[PDB]
């Protein structure tokens, strides 16, 4: 139950109801890992807590490509609830 | 919940044992949350993956204070296995009032 | 004013009048993008990449490209050029307020 | 000259004149960060988050927070406050 459902190549909803910021960071990370090649790994991440909460509704994550190259990929993952941005994370990846 | 055991006001060990990544960040955030007042909540968090760890082996988290302002607390949380740095976070906190 | 752009088209703009070259590039990039979205779509984040030093003795041309729409969000890519070479890009994300 | 900051400490800066436009937020936060980074480091990217609307009839206070150092790379965060409220934050990445 950190589980996500892919609605698209870039968009994911929680399966179960959530809000702990740790859940937001973890699921946003998982989400990004499904959009990046298996040989790329996270070097850092940077999460911004924009609005709290509710555990009573689902979270939708959207992954947006910021920058890529041979050795590096940058992603942004935004989380919505009730059609409002609550949380955004930038995740940096590097190759092998 | 990913529970830690306090060894001090300021240091913590895993009680139990890229979800590993999500674990490090979570726990590092739980750790730092035990060092701040009731109405301080994270505004942002910045984690650096320094070396892969083994799950299992316990993780030890040290929480330091970095340099305050007005309306914020800047914590650094570093994670260790075998006295070697695995992971560090900067977590920023603000008050509601 | 000073950052004024002349619209060449609905998605293309150029500077009117020729440390922080950077702030200017980000600022005009944002302004350019703001001309392609409705009033109540506000920027939630931007992400700017410094690709090559500018010339402050030539024109900057900005192209706005629509990357993605979702219910609540618009994602633009703004690319800045001088002499037909890429000097700068930003990804600017917007959300509707209701 | 209008994007002029007054240092208050090694890491904190107030606007001298009245601001908010996003573009001003971004540029002031970049100038603040440039005062705290060695002269031979240059910005490679910048990532700004519009957290709450500014008012231009109020001064903005910028705080530069170190995220990570090396000999080749420096990461900084710059946060902007009005009336003791976070309105805006930026991550700036520098290379030697």
CATH of the domain at D48: 3.10.129.10
Distances in Å between the Cα of B42 and the Cα atoms of A42, A49, B29 are 22, 7, 9
Q: Which residues of D touch A44 (CB under 8 A)?
A: 68
Cβ neighbours of residue B83 under 8 Å, at least 6 residues apart? none
Which residue in the set A22, A43, A44 is minimally distant from B29, CB to CB? A22
Min distance A88 CA to chain D CA atoms (Å): 9
What is the domain extent for residue D30?
1-96
CA distance C13 to C80: 9
Min distance C21 CA to chain D CA atoms (Å): 10
CA distance B95 to B85: 30
CA distance A85 to D11: 30
Preferred mutation among A45, A48, A68, A94 to probe D, highest tally of D CBs within 10 A: A48
In the numeric block, the tokens 């993605």 are attached to C68
Look up residue C9 and give its two tokens. Answer: 């088209």
Tell me whether residues A88 and D49 touch, CB distance under 8 A.
yes
In three-state secondary structure terms, B82 is coil
CA distance D11 to D32: 8
**Does the CB of D21 have a partner CB in chain A at under 8 Å?**
no
What experiment produced this structure? X-ray
Which residue in the set C19, C26, C47 is minimally distant from D23, CB to CB? C26
Based on the structure, what is the number of domains in chain B? 1
Q: Which residue of A has its CA nearest to D92?
A: A46
CA distance D62 to A48: 17
In three-state secondary structure terms, A62 is strand
Cβ neighbours of residue C78 under 8 Å, at least 6 residues apart? C29, C30, C32, C33, C62, C63, C64, C65, C89, C90, C92
CA distance C13 to C38: 17
Q: From start to end of D1-96, where are the E strands?
A: 5-7, 12-15, 42-50, 61-69, 73-82, 85-95
Segment (H or E) for C31: helix C21-34
Alpha helices, DSSP H, located in D20-80: 22-34
In three-state secondary structure terms, B66 is coil
Min distance B88 CA to chain A CA atoms (Å): 10
**Does the CB of A51 have a partner CB in chain D at under 8 Å?**
no
CA distance C47 to C20: 16
Degrees to nearest 5, angle at CA A17 with A13 and A23: 75
Pairing of strands D12-15, D61-69: antiparallel
**Does the CB of A88 have a partner CB in chain C at under 8 Å?**
yes
CA distance B19 to C17: 52
Task: Return the number of other C-beta atoms located less than 10 Å from residue C16's C-beta.
Answer: 12
Q: Which residue of B has its CA nearest to A3?
A: B19
CA distance A51 to A68: 29
Look up residue B18 and give its two tokens. Answer: 């890229």
Which class for D93: exposed (0-12), middle (13-18), buried (19 or more C-beta within 10 A)? Answer: buried
Cβ neighbours of residue C18 under 8 Å, at least 6 residues apart? C56, C57, C58, C59
């Amino acid at each position: 139950i950190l589980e996500l459902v892919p609605l698209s190549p870039t968009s994911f909803v929680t399966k179960y109801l959530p809000t702990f910021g740790g859940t937001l960071v973890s699921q946003s990370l998982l989400a990004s890992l499904h959009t990046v090649p298996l040989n790329f790994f996270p070097t850092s991440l940077h999460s911004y807590f924009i609005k709290g909460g509710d555990p009573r509704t689902k979270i939708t994550y959207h992954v947006q490509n910021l920058r890529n190259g041979r050795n590096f990929i940058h992603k942004q993952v935004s989380a919505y609830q009730h059609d409002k941005l609550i949380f955004t994370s930038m995740i940096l990846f590097a190759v092998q």
